[PDB]
Amino acid sequence: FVDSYSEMLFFLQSLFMLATVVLYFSHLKEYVASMVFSLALGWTNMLYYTRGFQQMGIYAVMIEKMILRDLCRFMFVYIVFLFGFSTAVVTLIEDSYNSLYSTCLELFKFTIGMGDLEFTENYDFKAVFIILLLAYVILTYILLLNMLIALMGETVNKIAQESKNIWKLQRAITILD
Amino acid sequence: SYYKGQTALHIAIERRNMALVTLLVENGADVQAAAHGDFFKKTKGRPGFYFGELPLSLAACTNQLGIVKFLLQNSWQTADISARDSVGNTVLHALVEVADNTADNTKFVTSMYNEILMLGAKLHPTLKLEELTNKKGMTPLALAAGTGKIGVLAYILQREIQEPECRHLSRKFTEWAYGPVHSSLYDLSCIDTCEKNSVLEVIAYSSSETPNRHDMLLVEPLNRLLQDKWDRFVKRIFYFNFLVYCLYMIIFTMAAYYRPVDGLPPFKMEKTGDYFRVTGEILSVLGGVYFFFRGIQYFLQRRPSMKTLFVDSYSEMLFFLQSLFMLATVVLYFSHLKEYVASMVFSLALGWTNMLYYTRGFQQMGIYAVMIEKMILRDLCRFMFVYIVFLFGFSTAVVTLIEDSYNSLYSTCLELFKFTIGMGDLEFTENYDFKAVFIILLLAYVILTYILLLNMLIALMGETVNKIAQESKNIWKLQRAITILDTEKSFLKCMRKAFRSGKLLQVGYTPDGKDDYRWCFRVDEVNWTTW
Amino acid sequence: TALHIAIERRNMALVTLLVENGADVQAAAHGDFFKKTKGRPGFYFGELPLSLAACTNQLGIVKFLLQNSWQTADISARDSVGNTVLHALVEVADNTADNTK
Ligand SMILES: CC(C)CCC[C@@H](C)[C@H]1CC[C@H]2[C@@H]3CC=C4C[C@@H](O)CC[C@]4(C)[C@H]3CC[C@]12C
Ligand SMILES: CC(C)CCC[C@@H](C)[C@H]1CC[C@H]2[C@@H]3CC=C4C[C@@H](O)CC[C@]4(C)[C@H]3CC[C@]12C
Ligand SMILES: CC(C)c1nc2cc(O)ccc2c(=O)n1-c1ccc(C#N)cc1
Ligand SMILES: CC(C)c1nc2cc(O)ccc2c(=O)n1-c1ccc(C#N)cc1
Numbered sequence: 001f002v003d004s005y006s007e008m009l010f011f012l013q014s015l016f017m018l019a020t021v022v023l024y025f026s027h028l029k030e031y032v033a034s035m036v037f038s039l040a041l042g043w044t045n046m047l048y049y050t051r052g053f054q055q056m057g058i059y060a061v062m063i064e065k066m067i068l069r070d071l072c073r074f075m076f077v078y079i080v081f082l083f084g085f086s087t088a089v090v091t092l093i094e095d096s097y098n099s100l101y102s103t104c105l106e107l108f109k110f111t112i113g114m115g116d117l118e119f120t121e122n123y124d125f126k127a128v129f130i131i132l133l134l135a136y137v138i139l140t141y142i143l144l145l146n147m148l149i150a151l152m153g154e155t156v157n158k159i160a161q162e163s164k165n166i167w168k169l170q171r172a173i174t175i176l177d
Numbered sequence: 178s179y180y181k182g183q184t185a186l187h188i189a190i191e192r193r194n195m196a197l198v199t200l201l202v203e204n205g206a207d208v209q210a211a212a213h214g215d216f217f218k219k220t221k222g223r224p225g226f227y228f229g230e231l232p233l234s235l236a237a238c239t240n241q242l243g244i245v246k247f248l249l250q251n252s253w254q255t256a257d258i259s260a261r262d263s264v265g266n267t268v269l270h271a272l273v274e275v276a277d278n279t280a281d282n283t284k285f286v287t288s289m290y291n292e293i294l295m296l297g298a299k300l301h302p303t304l305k306l307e308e309l310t311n312k313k314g315m316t317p318l319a320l321a322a323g324t325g326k327i328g329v330l331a332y333i334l335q336r337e338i339q340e341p342e343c344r345h346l347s348r349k350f351t352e353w354a355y356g357p358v359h360s361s362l363y364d365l366s367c368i369d370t371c372e373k374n375s376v377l378e379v380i381a382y383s384s385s386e387t388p389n390r391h392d393m394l395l396v397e398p399l400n401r402l403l404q405d406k407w408d409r410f411v412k413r414i415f416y417f418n419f420l421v422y423c424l425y426m427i428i429f430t431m432a433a434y435y436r437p438v439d440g441l442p443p444f445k446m447e448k449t450g451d452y453f454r455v456t457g458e459i460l461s462v463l464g465g466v467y468f469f470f471r472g473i474q475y476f477l478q479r480r481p482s483m484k485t486l487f488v489d490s491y492s493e494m495l496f497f498l499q500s501l502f503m504l505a506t507v508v509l510y511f512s513h514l515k516e517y518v519a520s521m522v523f524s525l526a527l528g529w530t531n532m533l534y535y536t537r538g539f540q541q542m543g544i545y546a547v548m549i550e551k552m553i554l555r556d557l558c559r560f561m562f563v564y565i566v567f568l569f570g571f572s573t574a575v576v577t578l579i580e581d582s583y584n585s586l587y588s589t590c591l592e593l594f595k596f597t598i599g600m601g602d603l604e605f606t607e608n609y610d611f612k613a614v615f616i617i618l619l620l621a622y623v624i625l626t627y628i629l630l631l632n633m634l635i636a637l638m639g640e641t642v643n644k645i646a647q648e649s650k651n652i653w654k655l656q657r658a659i660t661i662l663d664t665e666k667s668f669l670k671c672m673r674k675a676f677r678s679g680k681l682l683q684v685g686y687t688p689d690g691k692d693d694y695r696w697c698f699r700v701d702e703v704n705w706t707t708w
Numbered sequence: 709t710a711l712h713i714a715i716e717r718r719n720m721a722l723v724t725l726l727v728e729n730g731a732d733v734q735a736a737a738h739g740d741f742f743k744k745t746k747g748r749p750g751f752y753f754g755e756l757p758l759s760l761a762a763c764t765n766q767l768g769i770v771k772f773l774l775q776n777s778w779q780t781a782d783i784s785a786r787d788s789v790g791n792t793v794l795h796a797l798v799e800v801a802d803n804t805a806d807n808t809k
Contacts, residue, residue: 073541076542080530081530084528085529087430087525088522089522090434091436091521091525094438095438113600117595117598128522132526135526137598141598142557142597142634143549146634147549147552149635149638149639150552150639
C-alpha cells in the first residue's frame with residue numbers, strides 16, 4: 001500500500017471487469033455501473049507510464065508526495081467542519097431541503113465557487129440562518145482553502161532537490177521486472 | 178531611598194580593586210549591611226542595576242572570584258553565605274537574576290555558581306543552600322525555570338561533579354560504562370513531585386511572556402520524562418476520552434435531528450420513538466452539566482489572570498460556552514418558547530467544532546493545528562480590518578445611488594459580499610440613474626478586493642508558514658505537556674502511586690556517612706567518538 | 709568468558725596475558741545483552757572475542773590474536789546466528805561521519 005500500489009489498482013480494475021461480465025450474463029442492469037467504474041479506473045491507470053520520462057516522472061512523484069502529506073489532514077478538518085455545520089443548518093430547517101444529504105450538498109457547493117447563500121427560506125429565525133452560513137464560509141473558504149495552497153508551497157520547496165532520486169528508484173524496479 | 182543604606186564596602190568592590198577591598202574587609206566594616214536602595218532593586222520602570230542587596234553578592238555578580246574567596250575563607254570576618262536580604266534573595270538567588278542567557282554571560286554565571294557551592298560544602302557540610310527560599314517561596318532552581326533562564330537551568334539539572342566529597346552535590350550520576358555505551362542516572366528530585374513549585378508545573382503554567390518556555394522542555398532529563406509518562410499510562414486515558422466525546426456528540430446530533438415540529442413545547446410522550454428521543458435528550462443535558470462544573474473547577478484550581486485565558490487555554494472557555502448554550506436551551510424549552518431551537522443549534526455547531534481539541538495526541542495533526550492557530554492570529558485580523566473598510570464604504574456608496582428591491586443597506590452588503598466567493602452578479606439591480614456611475618463603482622471594488630487583496634493573503638500566508646515551520650514541533654510538545662499534567666491530577670487523584678516515574682536506587686554516600694536514596698531516571702547514550 | 713572483560717577495557721598488556729595463558733578465543737558469549745534485542749538496551753559486537761577487538765578499533769590486539777604462535781584465533785569462525793567477523797563489522801557501522809573511516 002505504500003509501495004507498489006499500482007499493482008493493486010490494475011488488479012482492482014480487472015476485478016471490476018469480471019464482475020461486469022458476471023452481472024451481464026445474469027440479466028441484470030447493474031453491469032453498466034460496474035463497467036463505468038472499470039472505465040474510469042482504466043483511464044486513470046494510464047498515469048503508470050509517466051515513469052520513463054524524466055520530467056513527467058518527477059511531476060508524478062511530487063503529486064504522490066503532496067497527496068500523502070497535505071490532503072489527508074485537510075480532509076479531516078474539512079469533514080469535521082462540513083458535517084457539524086450541515087447538522088446545525090438541517091436541524092434549523094422546517095418542512096425541499098429537510099434532508100441531511102440535500103443540505104450537505106448545498107454546503108459543499110461553496111467550496112467550488114457555486115454557493116447560493118439563499119438556497120432555502122423554510123425556517124424561522126432568519127438571523128440564525130445567515131450567521132451560521134457566514135461563519136462556515138469564513139472558516140473553510142477564506143481560511144482553510146487558502147491555507148492549503150500555502151502548505152503545498154512549503155512541501156515543494158523541501159522535496160524538489162531530492163525528487164530526481166525517487167524517480168530513478170521507480171524506474172530501476174521497472175528495469176528489473 | 179535612591180541610595181539609602183549604602184556602605185563604604187560597596188564602593189570599593191564596585192571599582193574592582195583587590196587591595197582596596199582587602200583594607201576595608203580587614204578594618205571590620207560590616208559585610209552583612211544591606212543597601213536597600215531602589216536603584217539597586219529591580220525597578221523595571223526606572224534605569225538601574227540589581228546585584229543582590231549585599232556586598233558578598235556584589236563580588237559574585239561582578240566576576241570577583243578572588244574577592245569572593247577572600248570574603249569567606251579568611252579569619253578576620255567571614256561573610257554570611259546564607260544571608261537573605263529584605264526580598265529574601267540569597268546569593269544563589271541573585272546569581273540567577275543576573276544571568277540573561279546571552280552567549281557570554283552563561284559561561285560566567287555557571288562557572289561561578291559551581292565554586293560557591295563547593296566552598297559551602299567544605300565550610301558547611303550539613304547546610305543545603307539550594308533548598309532555601311525567598312519571601313515568594315522560590316528556590317533558585319524554581320526561579321530559574323520561572324523566569325526563562327534556560328542556560329542556568331540546563332546546568333543545574335545535569336550537574337555532574339567529578340571531585341570526591343562533592344559528588345553528593347551532583348544530580349547526574351553514572352551507573353556503569355561500556356565500549357560506546359554509558360548509563361547515566363538523574364536526580365529527578367522536586368521535578369515532577371514537590372510541595373509547592375515543581376519544575377514541570379512552573380514551566381507549563383506560565384503567563385506566556387516567558388522568553389523560552391517552548392525551549393526549556395528540550396533539556397535532557399525533562400524531554401524523556403514526559404515521553405515516559407505518555408507511553409506508560411496517559412496515552413490510553415486520552416484515547417478513552419476521545420471515544421466518549423465522539424459518542425456524546427452523535428447522540429446529541431440524533432436527538433436534535435428528530436425534534437417534533439408541533440407547537441408550544443414541552444411535547445407529549447407517544448409511540449416508542451419518543452422514549453428513545455427523550456433518552457437522548459437526558460444524556461445531552463447531563464453532558465452539559467459535566468462541562469459546566471469542569472469549567473468552574475478549572476478556574477478555581479488555577480485562577481487565570483485574564484490574559485492567560487484568551488491567549489492560552491481558550492479551549493476551556495469554548496467548552497464552558499457550549500455548556501452555557503445547553504443550559505439556556507433547557508431554560509427556554511421549559512418556558513414554552515421557540516427560541517430553544519436557536520440556542521440548541523448554536524450549541525450543536527460549537528460542540529462539533531470543539532472536536533478539534535483532540536488533534537493534540539497526534540504529531541502531524543497537532544503541528545497542523547498549531548499552524549492554523551498561528552495564521553489565524555497573524556493574518557486574518559489585518560485582512561478583516563482592511564476588507565471591512567472597503568466593503569462598508571463601497572456598499573454605502575452603492576446603496577445611496579440606488580433609487581426605489583435592493584434599497585436597503587443589508588441587501589446591498591450581501592450582494593457585494595458574493596463577489597468574494599465567486600458569485601457576484603455585477604448586474605443585480607437596474608433601479609438607478611447614472612448607469613456609468615454604477616459600473617465604475619463596482620469595477621473599482623472588484624479590482625481592489627478580489628484581484629488584489631485576496632491574492633495578497635495567499636502570498637502572506639506562505640511567508641508565515643516558512644518562518645514558523647521549524648519551531649512548530651516544539652509548541653505542540655508544550656501543548657501535550659499541559660495535557661499530561663492535567664490528566665495526572667484529575668484521574669488518579671487518590672494515591673498518586675501507580676504513575677510514579679523512576680525508582681529508588683543507590684547512587685552514593687551522604688558526606689555525614691548516611692545512605693542517600695533518590696528517585697532516579699535511567700537514560701542511555703551512545704558515543705562512538707571520544708573513546 | 710574472562711577474555712571478554714580484558715579486551716573490553718582496551719588494555720593491550722592485559723589481553724596479552726590471557727591469550728598467552730591458553731584461554732579459549734573461540735568461546736562465544738551467547739547473551740541477549742550482546743545480541744541485537746531491539747526491545748532492550750544493549751550492545752552488539754559479534755559474539756566472539758576476536759570480533760570484539762575489531763569492533764573496538766583494537767588493531768594491535770587483532771594482529772596479536774592472529775599472527776602469534778601460542779593461539780591463533782579462527783578468522784572464519786561463525787557464531788550461533790552465523791555472523792562472521794566481516795558480518796559483525798557491517799552491523800557495527802551506522803553511516804555516521806566518523807564511523808565510516
Ligand atoms: C472513482 C473511480 C472510478 C476512479 C478513481 C481513480 C482513483 C481512485 C485513483 C487515482 C489516483 C489514485 C491514488 C494515487 C496515489 C495514492 C497514494 C498511495 O500511497 C495510496 C493509493 C493512492 C491513494 C491512489 C488511490 C486511488 C486513486 C485515487
Ligand atoms: C457559530 C458557532 C455556532 C460555531 C463557530 C465556532 C467558532 C467560534 C470557533 C472555531 C475555531 C475557534 C477559534 C480558534 C482559535 C482562536 C484563536 C484564539 O487565540 C482565540 C480564540 C479563537 C479566535 C477561536 C474562537 C472561536 C472559533 C472561531
Ligand atoms: C501519483 C502518480 C501520478 C501515479 N498515479 C497512479 C494512479 C493509478 O491509478 C495507477 C498508477 C499510478 C502511478 O503509478 N502513479 C505514479 C507513481 C510514481 C511514478 C514515478 N516515478 C509514476 C507514476
Ligand atoms: C486552532 C486549533 C485547530 C484548535 N481549535 C479549537 C477549536 C475549538 O472550538 C476548541 C478547541 C480548539 C483547539 O484546541 N485547537 C487546538 C489548538 C492547539 C492544538 C495543539 N497542539 C490542538 C488544537
